């Protein structure tokens, strides 16, 4: 498994473009695409993690684990009283959270479980995080920066300070890898915080369908339109691939051919 850094704490736009170039390029598949558009592999093909370290302006680190098949984030570790710790979400299967384990934290003899006591669920993320929808908590690399000083080596947090911390780190890392517009919200807002629009919401809740609907389409056209929004909050009807093509930065892994180009 890789490990690639994010220096949040001395963060550029042209170093963020960089970081997601390098995850995209870790985590697709070597071959599959569609529509030109590269595609995540099956959930054999190893390795099937990869580690994102996100360091603050003290040089304190956060290091996320995420699956290759699909970008979700499994867990997270930090440095704390000389001792791995690794946080596992509780949606994780008993196979799956002993590679978190072992990846995160591969020195068993100094390592120490500090679970994540809810799901990964964005409904659940926003539960903990008090609000009623994430357009409320605010995405930018000084609230992440911020963030991980609040965790990072802390012996005790609340789930509140954790789930925002998730809810950015997810959206900025994942999310931003799936979806070039969702990158490009970051670099477009690299110096202040922002809310995440409609259209950034849309897309992180359709990005299984709008795979499917990328691939199964022929000469372009869609089989069936494909409804997203707006950042305006306005319906979107999308009908042909070159439509959502240039927000896409990785498809979800879809079985069977496609039309590649």
């Not at 299984?208 to 372009?220: E, R, S, V």
Request: proline share 3%; with cysteine.
């Amino acid at each position: 498994v890789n490990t690639i850094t994010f220096d949040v704490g001395n963060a550029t736009i042209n170093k963020y473009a960089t970081f997601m170039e390098s995850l995209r390029n870790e985590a697709k598949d070597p071959t599959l695409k569609c529509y030109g558009i590269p595609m995540l592999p099956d959930s054999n093909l190893t390795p099937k993690y990869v580690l994102v370290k996100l360091q603050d302006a003290s040089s304190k680190t956060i290091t996320l684990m995420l699956r290759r098949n699909n970008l979700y984030v499994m867990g997270y570790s930090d440095l704390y009283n000389g001792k791995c710790r690794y946080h596992i979400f509780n949606d994780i299967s008993s196979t799956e959270s002993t590679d978190v384990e072992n990846t995160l934290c591969p020195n068993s003899n100094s390592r120490e479980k500090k679970a994540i006591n809810y799901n990964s669920q964005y409904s659940t993320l926003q539960n903990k995080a008090g609000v009623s929808s994430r357009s409320q908590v605010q995405l930018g690399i000084q609230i992440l920066n911020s963030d991980i000083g609040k965790i990072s080596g802390v012996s005790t947090f609340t789930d509140k300070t954790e789930a925002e911390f998730l809810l950015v780190a997810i959206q900025m890392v994942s999310e931003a890898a799936r979806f070039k517009y969702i990158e490009n919200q970051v670099k477009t807002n690299f110096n202040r915080a922002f809310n995440p629009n409609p259209k950034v919401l849309s897309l992180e809740e359709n990005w299984g369908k709008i795979a499917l609907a990328i691939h199964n389409a022929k000469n372009g056209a869609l089989t069936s339109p494909l409804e997203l929004k707006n950042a305006d909050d306005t319906k979107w009807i999308v009908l042909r691939v070159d439509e959502i093509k240039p927000d896409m930065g990785l498809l979800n892994y879809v079985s069977g051919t496609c039309q590649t180009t």
